[PDB]
Amino acid sequence: LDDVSLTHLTFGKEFTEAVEAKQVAQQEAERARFVVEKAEQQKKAAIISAEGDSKAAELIANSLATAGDGLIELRKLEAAEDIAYQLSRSRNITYLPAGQSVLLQLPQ
Amino acid sequence: KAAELIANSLATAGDGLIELRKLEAAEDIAYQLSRSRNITYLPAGQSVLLQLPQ
Amino acid sequence: FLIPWVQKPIIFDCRSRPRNVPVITGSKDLQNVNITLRILFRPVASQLPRIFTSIGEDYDERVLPSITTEILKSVVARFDAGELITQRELVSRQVSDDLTERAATFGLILDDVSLTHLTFGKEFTEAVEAKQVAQQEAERARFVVEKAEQQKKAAIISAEGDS
Amino acid sequence: MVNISLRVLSRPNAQELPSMYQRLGLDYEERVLPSIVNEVLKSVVAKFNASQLITQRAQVSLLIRRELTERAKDFSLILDDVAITELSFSREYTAAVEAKQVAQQEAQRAQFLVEKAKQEQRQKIVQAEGEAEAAKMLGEALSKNPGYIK
């Protein structure tokens, strides 16, 4: 015997049902696992962000220390400007009126 | 668990780590609490089509 | 006037002719570098008898590849791959002077020596591309800095103006 | 089981030809090469795990090259190059490539996020510095009297 293999485990009606059932259930499993791992991803993102800020703060502090007090002061101003902007973010521009089309008659 | 991990990470990352994560979160919250975006502008208007005689 | 069977003129061309010698050499970093040296040189007119007797008619083929390969490898070994990109002119000069010194012994004068196509070919594109991207980002960073300065300046002037 | 196709470029050593003819015959390439190659390939491959074959392939190819060269030399054959081509399973190869593609992309995206975070951090510092110096400049500028500041 070179090889022996089972082929077509069925019957026909159930064969279709079987494949279909398999697909749906497996998708459900897919969803479950995917959602958990993604939750982990968000978990990670949050951690990295926190550490990122952390390092940023360290660097900023270091930079301001080098740049002196003056450095700190206007960083504070920038931040205040940012905060103020966020507090109120909106504005509009005014224009004078435009016109509409009309027909021109040329004089004789 | 995220909280737990963050706490542990902060511990390894030291004090500096916690401080700016705190500011990050604060900015995030402040951001959402007041969110909106506006745009700068460029003024303009149509022009005229004039035929010149030749 | 010549005596026909007795003597034979051997006519050498004094004109400068380009010769490209491809050479594969390693840098200090042990990186493989493909460089093709472009050499323009001609014979010294007074030395022709000497060149013919010593090396021969084909002296371009015999001497050039040898000395060029020797010198180029010796020079290249000194610098690392990164230097070769930035420093190319310096390397070319150094190769030029050392080559000229060596060439003179044989009675050859080199008009110009230049490194051409530092590669490989895949490397041409990769290297240029990489540098390009880096340059774009760096320059954009430049724009950022400049723009920040301009805004700071504008702020100062505005305050002065309001003042 | 691993299916691998080895490609080899070879030439006979010009000095040894008489020995080649006496020992092997004219048919030297067909008789010697398949045997030596299969033997060495099997011997080398046996040492590494499947996972290594994928990541490590350059290492394995060099190892086979060196071993084959040594063996070939005794035959008076010179090998210019030896490289492994097509490492595979039928279906498994396809799946393998897909898996690699996906993993690579995710990893790169991960770096995108990290890099961007770095960039934002830098921007924040630079702006803080900028404001700072702007403040300093403004203050100094005020020297144009208090009317200036007003």
Author numbering:
A (entry chain A): 165 to 272
B (entry chain K): 3074 to 3127
C (entry chain C): 627 to 789
D (entry chain B): 373 to 522
The authors write:
Finally, we re-extracted the subtomograms at 2.5 Å pixel size for automated 3D refinement with implied C11 symmetry, resulting in a final cryo-EM map of the prohibitin assembly at 16.3 Å resolution (FSC, 0.143 criterion). The final cryo-EM map reveals a circular bell-shaped structure that is embedded into the lipid bilayer with a diameter of 190.2 Å directly above the lipid bilayer. The whole bell has a height of 84.0 Å measured from the lipid bilayer to the top of the particle and a narrowed top with a diameter of 89.0 Å. Notably, the map reveals a large empty cavity on top of the bilayer enclosed by the bell. As the structures of PHB1 and PHB2 have yet to be solved experimentally, we relied on AlphaFold2 to predict the structures of full length PHB1 and PHB2. Numerous possible arrangements were tested but we found that each of the 11 densities in the cryo-EM map can accommodate only one prohibitin molecule. The final molecular model comprises 11 monomeric PHB molecules forming a bell-shaped assembly. On the contrary, adjacent PHB C-termini interact more strongly and stabilize the centre of the bell top. We also identified self-linked peptides where the same residues were crosslinked in overlapping peptides, thereby indicating the occurrence of homomeric interactions. Interestingly, these self-links only satisfied the distance constraint at the PHB1–PHB1 or PHB2–PHB2 (Fig. 4b(i,ii)) interfaces and were violated when mapped to the rest of the PHB heteromeric structure with alternating PHB1 and PHB2 subunits.
Prohibitins are a highly conserved family of proteins that have been implicated in a variety of functions including mitochondrial stress signalling and housekeeping, cell cycle progression, apoptosis, lifespan regulation and many others. The human prohibitins prohibitin 1 and prohibitin 2 have been proposed to act as scaffolds within the mitochondrial inner membrane, but their molecular organization has remained elusive. Here we determined the molecular organization of the human prohibitin complex within the mitochondrial inner membrane using an integrative structural biology approach combining quantitative western blotting, cryo-electron tomography, subtomogram averaging and molecular modelling. The proposed bell-shaped structure consists of 11 alternating prohibitin 1 and prohibitin 2 molecules.
